[PDB]
Each structure stands twice: as C-alpha cells, then as structure tokens.
C-alpha cells in the first residue's frame, strides 16, 4: 500500500517494463516488504500501473523493485478524484487500505483476483540469473547484512582475497583444525546415509571405456591480488581510479537476540563497506603504493607505466593487493570480499574516450585468410586483458574508442541469432515477393512449363547480382586499410553468380535434366510431408494425413535450392571439365550455422544423381541400370544409426513413385528397385545368413535395426515380422510392416509379389555383396577391410558372371552357376554380362574431425578409392564428384588438397561483413533474443564441491520461479549436464542421486538466510551415452517431451504438481556425453551447465547450441583454476564469445611421412592389387606372382608414386615412396619362389595344414612391413588385473 | 581363488600404477603386488645393452634381462587395500576380515564386481533385510621412509588406547552448505571426534607412531623412527617412480654419446630407427641458435627401479621391488619423433659473466644450501648450474605453448636437457619428443612444426605471454633464500608441467633469466623482445 513516482532511470526495455527504481539507500525504505501493492505514477500526477512486489534488492545509492503481478492502465486517470495524499517530497507514502480497496473497482474497474500475471520469459531468465548470482557471489542480504551461525569464508564460493601470510603457507584440507574448536560438539550431525532415496533411476549398463588425464591440486591454492592491463592514448596527463570492496566484523554477544536450539547465543557477523578514489599522474616508471581507504592502510594498489610506443600510446598495468596481518582469534577479519576496480577519465577533461586498442602483437608473417578474418571482425575490438579476473569495457560512439574499463568476477555475454531472411518487414523486397507469391513451393515447381520455370528461377540470381552491385561502392570507403581483401571478396561472389547462371542454362538445353528435376522435387515433397505423420503416429496421438499437407511444409530455403542449381552441370554430363582433368577440379565445401537444413540440402543432390543415371544409357560399354551410385560416409558409430532412419524415408518415397509410374506403361525408371544398405562393423550387424537365422532362433526361446515403420508408424514386433529364406549357399532376409488390416504398401498383404518385398533395406554383409544397393551409408573404419576380403569388388561393379538363383559371383565362391531341378524349380545355367559403371558421388559429413592421425590414415587409403572408381569414355578418364560439409572452416585449402587432391569452393562466400551476407542475417538483440553465457571460476574448492553447489543453486532457484509464475518456467525446470569423458560422468553419477537430493531437501532448515532458493524434491535421473542400449534410446528421447504439470491452490496461494496413477513423470536431471544426438528440435530444453572447457572450439559451439531454440537460452560454463586452458579462457571471456571463428585451433593432415608410410603403405598396395584384378582376388592368389604378371605391380606402384608427388609437392617424398614401394615389392617377390609350401594371405580353409600365411595382424610382435591394420585407429591391447581374496591377521599393535 | 576386475593400458604400469600403487577403480581399490610373485615365463624380453649395463651398476651384477608386462587368468596380481570399508545405507565402518562383509561378482562383466553388506536393516534396524553396496574409506597413513598402512580409526576415536569393542559410524554436518566436515561416533562409549584434527599442526599430537608395513611384500619391519603423515586416497603425493631412460643411437654416462652423435657434421641415416633432416633456422633468432635438427624416426626405451612415498626423490630413502636382490626389471619402448635445438657457444659464455646473472646464481645457490641442510645431506654436491635454469625454463614454456596453440594433450610431450659442463666438452641444447605410441601429433604432426615458418611464431608467442603472470606481484618478489625452495619466480600458473613430462620435478626453474620481469631487468638473455 504505497505510492511512488517514476523517473525512468533504467536502460534495458524488458527491465523497464517490469521494474520500479527508487533513489537512496534502503535504510530509508525499511517499511516496504514483499507481497505489497504499490501504485506507480508519472511526474504530472497520472495513474499508470498497479503491481505486486516479488523481491527487493539494494545497493549504495539505488534500490530496485521486481514485480510479479502487474496491470497496465490503457486510459488516462487523474489523481484529483482520488481521495489520497500526494507523495511526500518525492518519497514513499502510506496508503489507507479501505479507500484503495474501494477505489479499485470504482476508478479502475478491477478487483484483486483479476490482475493478470506476467508472461514474458526474458524476465524469467533475468530473475534466475540474479538469484544464482546473489547466492554464489554476494552480498545477498544487502550491503549492511547480518550473517548468523556460520563463518563468512565458507558462506560464499567466488571472489575473495586472502591475507599475504596465509597465501605463502598454503593448505592441506578445506577446514583448519583450530577454527572449529567449539566447546560443544557439532550437535546438528545426522547419519551419513542415503536416507529416503527412492532413486527411480533406470540403471542401464553395458561395456565401454575412454581416456584419462591428471593435473595438480585445486586445494592448495588461494590468490591474494588481482589486476588488469590497458593501453591509453598519448597527450593526456592524469586519470581517475575507483576501488571498492567489503569487510566483515564480529558482533559481541549482548548486542543480538538470535538463539540456538539449546537456548544459547549464536555467532553473528556484520558487514561494512570500504573504498575510495585516487588520481594518478602519467609519468613513466613504477607507481608508488597508495591506499584508498585510510582506516585500513595496509591494503594497496600498484603497477608500472612504460614508455611511449611506435604509434603514440602507452602501456599501463594495475593491481590490488592485500598485505594485512593474520590475527590469532577470529581469523576471518583480515579477508577481503567482493572486490572491483574502475578506471575512467578525469573529471575536467574535454573528451572522455581515451582507451584504445591493444598493440597488434605482430610476428612478421602474413596469411591472407587471417587478414580476411581481421577484415570481417572489424567492429569487435579487444581493449583490455585481466590478470586473475575478467574484464569489461564501455564503447563510445566511435567503435574503436572506449570511455570506461572495469573488472568482472563472473562475466556474461549474449550472442546474436542467425536466421534466414524472408519473413521480416525490413528485408530485401524480392525475398518477400518470393515468400508471398509462393515461388519456393515444391509442388508448384514440378508442374511448371519450361519458360515459367526460367521466369521463377531468374529472380534469385537477379537479386544476387544486384546485391553484389551495391557491395562494390564501399571498397575504399568503409573498408579502409583492407583494399586487397575487399577486392578478393567480390571476385568469388562474381564466380558464384557465373556458376548459378551456367546451371540454369544447362537446365534449359536438356530434357533428361528437366525430368530428373521434376522427379527430385516430387519425391522430396512427399517424404517431407510423411515423416511428420510417422512421428505423430508413433507417439500414440490421433492424427490424419490431410492435416499436414499445407504450404508451410513443402517449401524450400534459398541456399538449398541455390546449392542444387550449382550442383547440376557436373552430374548431368560425364564430359564436364570438373570430371576429366586432374587440375582445377573444384570440390564443393558447404558450411553454415548449425540448425539450418544442410542435410536436406545435400540429400536432394543424391536424389537428382539417382534419377538421372538411369536415363542416360550404356555409355562406354558399361551397364547403367543397376549398381551402387552414392556413397555416404561418417566418423562415429551412433550418428550413422540416427541418419539411416532419415535416409529410409526418401528411399521409400522413391520406391512408391517408381511403382506407380510403371503401372502407366512408363518404363523410363527401369525395372530394378531402389534399395539402401548399411556397412558397419560386425558388432552391430551379422555377417552371414547363418547368423541371421541364429539370431531369430535365439529370439524365440541383430538384423532388426528398425523399431517402427518409416512410412506408416506402426510398431514392428521382431517375433513375427522377419523371414529368413533357406540357404544351401545363401539366403535373403526380409522385414515386413506390422500393419494388420493391410493398407500399408510395405505389409505382407501387398508387397509379396515384388522383386524385393517389404521394407527395402539390407543389413547382412553377404546379402549386400550379392545384390548391391543404390545407396550406401558406411563408417570410415570399415574401409580398412579391403585388403582382407576379396569379395568387396562387387560394390565397385567389377563383375563377370551371374547365377539366376543366387546373384553376382566372384572367384572362389560357393555357387558356380549350375544346378539341377529341385523343389520343382527349373534348372539354370551361368551367363556372362558386361561390367557395371562405378559410382558417381562421394559425400563426407563432419569433415572438421578429419584431422590429426585419423585424417592422415584416411588420406593414405584414399589413393585406392579414387583409383577404383574410374573409367574411360572416348579416351578421356572420368572421375567421381566429391562434396563435403563442415561447421567451422579453417585452413580448408591445404586440408582438401591433402585429403582429396582437388581445389576448393566454399559456398556461400564471405561478404564484407559478418552480419549481412546474402543468404544469412545475424539479427539484433533489440528485436529477437539471444543465447546468454555465464562463467564461474573459483580456487580452493574441489571439483565435486563446485559441482554440487552450482547444481543445487540452479535446481532450487528454478523451483522458486515455478511456485509463483506457473507454466512459463517449464524450459528451466529440467537441467542438462554436458561432459567431456566417461570417467567423469561416472564419478558425477554417484554424487547426483545421493548428495544433491539431500542438500536440496534441507535447503531452508537452518538459521542462515537464503533469499531466493526454495524447497524442491528430486526423484528422476536419466543418462544419454553410448552405454545405453539401442532399443531403449527412442524411449528416453520420447520421454523428454512431457511437461511439468501445474495446478493452482488457493490455500497455499501458489502452484503445485500432482501425478495421477499410471502416469509418466517428467525428468529432473539429464546427463550427456559427446553424443548429444537430439533427434528433433526439442522445444523444452533451455538450461545447460557445461563442465570443463572442451578440447576444441567446434565441439563447444556444437554442444552449446542445442538448448535455447524456441525459448531463450542460458549456459553456465564451470571452469577450474588449476588447469591452464580453463584459466586462459576465463581471463579472456568476453572476447572469445564475440569472435568465435577467429579462435579455431589448428589442424594438420600429412600422409607420406615416414611414420605414416610405415603403417598404411602395405595396406594400400595390397588393396589396389586385390580389388582390381582376377588372379589376385582369391585367397590363394599370393603364390601367383610370377615373372609374367609383374606389369600390374608397376601400374599400382606408378599410381601411388604419382599421388605422393602431386600432394607432397616435393621430389624427396616421391623418391622416398618409390624406394619403400620397391623394397616391399622385392620382399614379396622373394616369397613366391620358395617351393615346398602353398602360399596364401591368411590361414583359412581345409587346406590350412600346408598353408603358409603372408600377412599379419597387430598382435604380440612389434610392427613390421607385413603388419596390416584392421581400423583407422588402434590402441595396443591392455593388461588385465587378477584379484586375490583371502584373510590376513594383524597381531601387531599401535603405540605412542 | 582368483578373479578378474579390470584392465589398463600397458603405458601406465611404469608411470602411474606399478608395483606399489593405489588403483582407484570404479567399484573398489587395490594395490599392485611385487614382482617375485609375477609370472616370469610370460614376459617378452627387450634387447638393449647400453641400458642394461647402466641398471647393473646400480642394482648389482645379478640383474639378468629387461622384460615387458606379462601378456584365462593371466595378468598383473593385485590385492584389496585399504582393508576397511563403508556401507551406503546404514553408515557402518568395519574391516573386510571381521566376516561381516561379503563379495558379489559376475565373471563376463568383471567391472561390476563389488562388496556387499549382507542383511542390512537400516541405521536403527527396522526394515526388511536386503543387500547394499560397500565403498572404501578414503584416508590412509603414509611414512616418508616408504611405508603405507591403514588409518588407525580406533585409537583416533577413543583418544588413545581403550578397551571398548563397539561399532563406529560416520556423521555429516546436517546443513545444506557445509560440505567437507566428517565426524566419527562410538555406539557404546559415545566418543565423538572430527577428521580435521588429523591434518596440520594438530596432527603431531594426535597420531601414533609408524608400524613399518610394506603391504606389497606382506612383511613388517621392527620399528621406524620417522614421523607419520596422513594422506587422502588417490592424491598425487602418495607414489613416485624411479626411472632410467635412454635413446637408441647408432653404434660412461648415459647422455655422452647422445650429444656426440646428435651434433656431428653429418648425422648418420643408415640405421633403421634413426633418420634426421637439417631443415632451416628462423629469421629473428640468427645470433642465438646455431642448428635446428629434425628427427623423423626415433626410439626410446625405459626401465623402472624403485619408488618413494611422500616427497619426490633427489640411497637410503628408496624402497625395493622384491624380497631380495631382484633378477629382472620392467621395461618399455616407444617409436616416435622429435625436434632438436642447438644454441651458440660464444653468446652463452658472454652472458655467463655479467653481474645480475652472478647475483641470481648466488641467490639460487643459497637456496640450494638451505634445502639440503633440512634433510641431512652433503650441501656442496650435485649443483646443476645457472645455464641449466635458463634452458630448462625455456623448455617448460615451449611445451606449454605447444599444448595451448595446437590443442594437444599436456602429457603427450617429453623433454630432455643437455647442459653438462664438467669434463671440458661444453653442452647446450634441448630435446622434445613424444611420450605415448597413440598420443597427439603422433604421425608426423610434431615434425610439421619444426619448419621455420611456424617455430618462430610459436617462440614469439611463448615469450610474449610470460611477461606478466596471473599471480604477479607475489610471484616475482619470491626469494628462495628465505624459505629454502629450489624455485624463484616460477609458480604453477606460469612454469610447471605435469609430472609425467618433467625430467627433474620442478626444481631449478626461474623465468627472470629469460625476459624482463616486474622486478628484474638486466638479467635477460633475449633482448628487445
Ligand atoms: N524446408 C524446410 N522448412 C522448414 N523446416 C526445415 C526445412 N528443412 C529443414 N528444416 C528443419 O531443420 C532441421 C534440419 O536440421 P539438419 O538439416 O539436420 O541440420 P544440419 O544437418 O545442418 O546439422 C529439420 O529437423 C527440420 O525441422
């Protein structure tokens, strides 16, 4: 019941809506408390707002009031009719209750219970941030607070300086023995037990392991000083320095009335403010010691000042040291809490902006990419650096000058949001024309005639050319000092426009291309509609198909269509220059912020490639109506299994349209269907049909890699939906849909007559090596199997013979193509067939992880993959097309030339600014929210103590926000914890369900005052990692989408949850390693707590970007003082978070070094020797190397030496490779002529009693020439520990 | 009678674990046994004579060979330690061999083995009986001379000797904010005490004398006059190794022929495991650096001889591996690559005879004399010199910058310094090679940075970072004559590396010998940077 007067002091708009700010210390305003109504006016005397108070905070000059319910008056109401008194002398004034209650309906047309509640969520993220800041940093009870029943040093976690005597001797334990000696024992002890646990954890388990590391202690350290470093302009004389801190003092017993449980008095401390301002002349030399506050003269400020530099500025360093002395009783009165330093200009200067850039720190070397990066980021300027603390600067109107600098203990910074233009009212008019008239509709673009097609596609290129035209007015005007880079930027955009027009021209002068374009658009639109229906059905909701067929769902995004038009002319003709010459063959590289659709961008190219290949014909004497087309290869193991589900839907839609087209007599698409297979290790998938039978046999008393049907969403039961045909030499495994009525096209009622019935997949390896699919999704490490197994050459199309009953044949197989009549099937005979065309496209994802030893090992084995996929056409040699995709680009040119041996073409190009390139727009904080970051660094404490405290603070502050506001707090009620290793996650897992629940239950059960936290019950904990079984993963991902349920109780006056019988519970804490493989854009998750700085920048950007996509996000990185990388990042926090891409760590890919030639050379030689010829294909081919076969050895040797010379660009490497290959070839040549034995590759088969092996495996012996690896990475096998359990008696006894 | 528990990489058996070390597994903790109870017939020998003749001089002529780690029950033998545990549900403290604790296992998935408290009924004892999990207790008792033994719980809780035979519990603070406090309570005597009274100055008045227990040998000494110290479980100051390593060079100190071979006019390249290139020298560093040599193929063998407990080693404080004089020692070998930097002789001799260098040398020798007095050793021997501190500091900074710039792991990189000046063949140079066989920058990644385009940038950034430390006024004011340290102006936040990488143990390091610092100017070796 108060009346105040507004004066509009606060700056941020969201804060100014929901707050009232008063002047003066809170000691005058002690009559105002929580749950109070205040009625806010303006200066003239007009009623504007009516609100209710949530919280009060205070400072040395101002007090801020936060609301929880508020009404905004729309009309104009005067104070004259109000019976009340005007505010006394612009302070607070008391309201009579009755007149306020009577006037609320009379002159405001409202009651108490009709007040609407606050709905914004930026307000809520602000309140949560303030709560955690108060509880971890302080002061919490104001500047004149009282602390009861505990010591001041352990109350707070961050930002405290020790006296100098303590810092030299260090620590051995968090608690000193002499400071705890009370008369009584600690009476508030409780038994150290997992009390009332009820963990409700699923407790899934498996087998996995990771790496390990170590560091020095975080216990034996405490600092006693902090500083900064700033560079100042010349021709000035003096500056102003302000320092403030806080001090604590013990209140004697007769002065308070706070009692313990047993009637005795308790310890009470009190806080007093400190600090003052000084003025310092600018003379070269070390600064004299000075004391700002006279009452504590033994705390200082110091530094040094250096001479003038080459430009006209000066370097100045400043510190702040505690040099006090340690007493014997009440040792905490010599510690300094909450320090801060401010440096500004003098009070009487003419111009304030005197702080300039740090010197560039040049090193007499230039890299054009680096200068381009400095040109792009020219409005992010780094002014100062902190020593044992973080820093902050205030930027003037000029973006190269600053007026104020200071220090921050826990720093924050908010990042702008990348979006695609087209929806806002301030974008380019042509994009709004495209959206409003519907020229990106995928159904519309498949039915247009050719001339309206050119009309529609021309607008994009016209507007791109226009944008480049206004980009050229500012070469020397706005980019001063960077003329060379401002020209090289425009050159590549002009090349991009040229290639777009070339693509449209190729589309105009062809008919196969137009047919393929229409086919790809139709298939993509259908799959895009149906995937959402499948996801809705699998979760058990009730939906129909016509709900999802609206215009929102079947439209393109401009960079995807642009990539498609770029990609056309190289695939529509094998005679294009990109595929016939070894120089200037541009390999496209696509990079973009994560969240935009790169995956649907690069799946359309595969669809177009698949459709166009069957419309060409048997060019060059090669078959072209069947065989493998597109290879799609990845690095990890789990993301492959996640992407296979996405690829199946496209294959299904293509099969549907192929089946519907043939019914009209149109045979352009052919007869053979489209199928897709995996190619991963033998742990996940079976090898032969016998094992596929064994798995189903063991099931009824694993080829089932699918859980639900892609096309319809019916549950797949493994018991009855699998058929394995009998196998005298080989069989075919089929998987059917689980529909019972018979309306799905992939059930047993409809598809039984097709050449490939049911779901068109392949899982078994020998099934793939007989009928090769159209598409393949593999992992990198499987490619090392080429030198072992000789039947892989079917995948590249090197075949001769075929059996009608089994499939394609290789030398040394079971069936030779002849049979008798049996089960009534007619007898058949073998036939000969011309060869098949090798694949056309290679696709690589997560290309930034191809670096280091993995990158080198990929690069050396890629000599064979490029060689085997080649062929001839009119004398020329045709080579495949390569596409890669990354998240961060850095030194891409050398990486692509070393791995793939091509040129590079990064799309989309740079532009002159980081904010306004053509296809992306980096929006503004005033109009769309961002992703705030926050940082915590603290010495002394252990890593478990910091983790427990941060987790408890977030969990209990979120609950307090829930209790007053309701359902908008839902994003911040479930906490995600991201980790870097399995061992540390295992360590934290024990602490999660034992300690945090106990510390969160008893959060308000002592006499210490905690203003913001609240009572919370923790019940549910899950975990997402590689040790979770693959059947259970989609159940956990589908559990994360349930919301916390709320209900309003008028007895307590708040909201409360209640869970009915047989209902699912929401999850409280979720823990996730590297594999944060979130399936969809999960709308709930909006709070993550990173635990430790990752070893890479790309990983940090990938992991932290998942949270906060539909609601505002908030990340808190927890850093440790004892590690170098963490401290280095802490001191430079606010600059690293504004220039991400400038700071990407280095990489290297170097095959053909001696250490990599000692590993990969024999494997590559044998792979090229085996998978290309017929005499060396079978297992007994090792003895065949005669004096008549050596001409193929020369071919392989020449290929390897040529690539080594072309990539290393030095003749020494070529000479070295030639010598190594010659030695290996001669070593092979000696072993052939040793008669008396039968020589082969492995000891295998019934002839093994006289077989002598040639090559080996990594085992007991040291490495050799003939050791051939089985993966791209190996650790030597470990040693196992052998426990002993027994009893030993201890007769010996202790003594003083 | 035996069962598997887990596995570890063969690298860690000679640098972190090994015959005497605590192993903190996910479910339990064990201590590796000695080597005369190892399976000798399943260890593959390693052929290296130049290191065998060095081990035989130290440990006597009876040493036979160097042997690799032993490799369906073949493995390294362990035994549970500490032999007291805690219960999660009832909070009970009791040794393993009273009979109240039982062991569960599953053989196919041996990482899930743990101990159980059979028939737990609650603290008061009013719930249906079940099985709960048992975890070790996390404090031990360490003796400087080499002994480790269980913590004396009964004597500590009863304030000395007592006749009681009750049971014990743990209690916590019961507040939401205190986190580290512990309490021990007797069920019959109600004697209560806290764990804070075992560390610091109060520890001397409260803990009893050492008993003399070598756990890995199952053997007790008669008496031990040293004073004891309490240590945590898994802390880094509980086991230190003694190592002796050599480089495989073509063909009586170890490091003599290494310097003779590496600085020849034409370093040989006909041996399989030694191949070298002479690429370049940077632009700003002409007067100081004379030769920079790259190694494309390198090979290093190791050995293990002993251990020490509380303090790093500097021979009566070292503890053996076996019951008698041993007959073989563990060994290892790694194939890798390295970078060799040589420095100019005349520039160094000019810099050795200045004034501030002599003052800093006098300060360090006073500190060395102060250190060696407090441990009853000869105080006029084994001083390295002043050249050693400068080269050694530069090496530590270079390793830190290799980790910071390239994203490597810190433990992956090892140093080796050459600064002997006693026999009239002066030395100056550092070496840096690779630690593990599967580490960062293994396949030609380190030799990439040996080219003159990258090394100069790395050096410039390394030297320009170390101008002001993060704990700065107190770091440069540090004086080792006052309190007998072996370092001056070299703290954790500017100079020290992990114990795996370091060759000496963070002794004899000082950074003001390299650049101007906040208190000294005229002692620098690199001027104008
Ligand atoms: N044309 C489109 N219209 C609307 N949303 C789209 C479109 N294309 C993709 N998306 C959304 O973007 C997501 C694609 O993300 P993804 O392509 O996997 O990112 P990246 O592959 O770049 O990491 C899909 O889940 C989908 O919801």
Numbering used by the authors:
A (entry chain A): 13 to 713, 723 to 1317
B (entry chain B): 5 to 75, 88 to 267, 335 to 397, 405 to 619
Sentences from the paper on this structure:
Two dominant, distinct populations (~120,000 particles each) emerged during focused 3D classification; one of which had strong DNA density (DrmAB:ADP:DNA) and one lacking observable DNA density (DrmAB:ADP). Notably, we were able to separate DNA-bound from DNA-free particles through focused 3D classification, ultimately yielding 3D reconstructions of DrmAB:ADP:DNA and DrmAB:ADP at nominal resolutions of 3.3 and 3.4 Å, respectively. We observed strong density corresponding to ADP within our DNA-bound and DNA-free maps, both of which were at the interface between the RecA1 and RecA2 domains, the canonical ATP-binding site of SF2 helicase domains. Comparison of our two maps revealed the presence of a 55-residue loop in DrmA that is otherwise absent in the DNA-bound structure. Due to the flexibility of this loop, we were unable to confidently assign sequence position. We modeled this region as poly-alanine. Thus, the presence of this loop is mutually exclusive with DNA binding. Given that the presence of TL and DNA are mutually exclusive, we hypothesized that in the absence of single-stranded DNA, this loop may partially occlude the DNA binding site, preventing DrmAB from loading onto non-phage (i.e., host) DNA. In the absence of DNA, the DNA-binding channel of DrmAB is occluded by an unstructured ~50 residue loop within TL. I In the absence of phage infection, DrmAB complex is autoinhibited via TL.
